[PDB]
């Protein structure tokens, strides 16, 4: 009998380019006269609700209604309130979501590691990892683009952020990608992007290639003598 409301993380607003404010009802079957609204402090119920769900024997009838707002309004801590009025309870069900307050904004220092030499000796595949660390919030959305066009999400897995041991307020996240080793031998730029609020432009790109990690000079010293 609780209407869970999901706050749009930075990954969602980055991937979908717009804002979604949703109200999902849990442990409640489908009844008529559904009344849901998104309201701020002074009050602007100026949006519509679409895609009403259907009953489920687990009683998770969503009754979801997505709200589209400006990007900076959500970042301004408007503290939107979702009030749900239904037949079971005449009193409105007030559940609220807001942008977190007081969180420090420390920009990530993304490091792109080329595949190891032991990767390439077996000639099976190349495992490029994208090391993202130093971000104090945990809103990380990492894509991979080759030659401009983004890669499929199936190739790369972005692990959930985990606490940093040395830095108490910072988190680290790693996103590896598995690609064929001969394609690495051909020579093609693989770019890993990181999306985060604390970045000056919320986008930082690093480029890896066959020639990023190479010995700059060779110091062969051939010494042949016929004496002992």
């Amino acid at each position: 009998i609780r209407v869970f409301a999901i706050p749009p993380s930075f990954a969602s607003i980055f991937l979908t380019k717009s804002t979604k404010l949703t109200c999902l009802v849990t442990d409640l079957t489908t009844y008529d006269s559904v009344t849901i609204s998104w309201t701020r402090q002074n009050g602007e119920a100026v949006k519509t609700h679409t895609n009403i769900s259907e009953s489920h024997p687990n009683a998770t009838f969503s009754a979801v209604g997505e709200a589209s707002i400006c990007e900076d309004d959500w970042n301004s801590g408007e503290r939107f309130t979702c009030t749900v009025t239904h037949t079971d309870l005449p009193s409105p069900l007030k559940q609220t979501i807001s942008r977190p307050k007081g969180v420090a904004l420390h920009r990530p220092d993304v490091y792109l590691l080329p595949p190891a030499r032991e990767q390439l000796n077996l000639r099976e595949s190349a495992t490029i990892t994208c090391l993202v660390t130093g971000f104090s919030p945990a809103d990380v959305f990492v894509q991979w683009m080759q030659r401009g066009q983004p890669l499929s999400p199936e190739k790369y897995v972005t692990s959930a952020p985990m606490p940093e041991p040395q830095a108490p307020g910072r988190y680290f996240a790693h996103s590896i990608l598995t690609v064929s080793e001969e394609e690495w031998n051909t020579g093609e730029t693989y770019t890993c992007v990181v999306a985060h609020e604390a970045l000056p432009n919320r986008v930082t790109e690093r480029t890896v290639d066959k020639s990023t990690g190479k010995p700059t000079l060779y110091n062969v010293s051939l010494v042949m003598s016929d004496t002992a």
């Binding site: 499929s152 199936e154 598995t178 064929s180």
Partner: protein, 277 residues
Amino acid sequence: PDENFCKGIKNVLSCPPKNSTGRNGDWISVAVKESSTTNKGVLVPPRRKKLCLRNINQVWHRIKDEKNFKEEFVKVALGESNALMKHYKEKNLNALTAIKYGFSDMGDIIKGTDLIDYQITKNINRALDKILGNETSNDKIKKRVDWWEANKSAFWDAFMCGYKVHIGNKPCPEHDNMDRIPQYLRWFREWGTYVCSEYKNKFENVIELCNVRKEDKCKGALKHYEEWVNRRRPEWKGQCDKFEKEKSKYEDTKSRTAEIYLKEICSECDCKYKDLD
């Protein structure tokens, strides 16, 4: 005649050995596919992963005519014929299946319908499109299919040139015309042949140990068999699921269970099928 005419020798670049890797390839490890949602559970062979396209990778941009386009694929086909048979010469096994599978894989790369996400495949597709002219997607796909169907003769003759530099006097085999069979069914057949050979070996071992003699070495043989079947079951599940999804679109695959499709046509030992039932 059922042979090939005397073909001039062309320059070919060296390729890494197929047996150079100590792990000898991994069937389970798949690197890149077009999509793992609509094409789920399909396994790439080590042969496809080790498919050496070094010859065409050097001159995929300088090429400007279809005569060189045919000639360059002949050069890489000769290299594949040398590489596959030398690998199986040490293994003492017939290399005809590998030769025809490699030819079909190369032809599907020429089509652009090969079940791979190579940019090399995209580069060759763009080069062939600019060779014949640019049209709409379906039109250029059909034109490339027609061009490969017309020009596969020289490529396949080069393959038996590499075959007959070793076999010699014995007659050349027939084409068998499986080019209409797509990539995933051929990978299914290769996987079935490989896993059936390994089941033959492991079943021979477990019989020769357990049936005559519970010895500790026999228990180890049963444990190895259990480990291998546990490793190979998800592969069968994924490949059978893929077969069920792409079931209805050819006549040869109208036989309902995938195991009997493997059994009834070719490239199998008629021994084991790993059915969950």
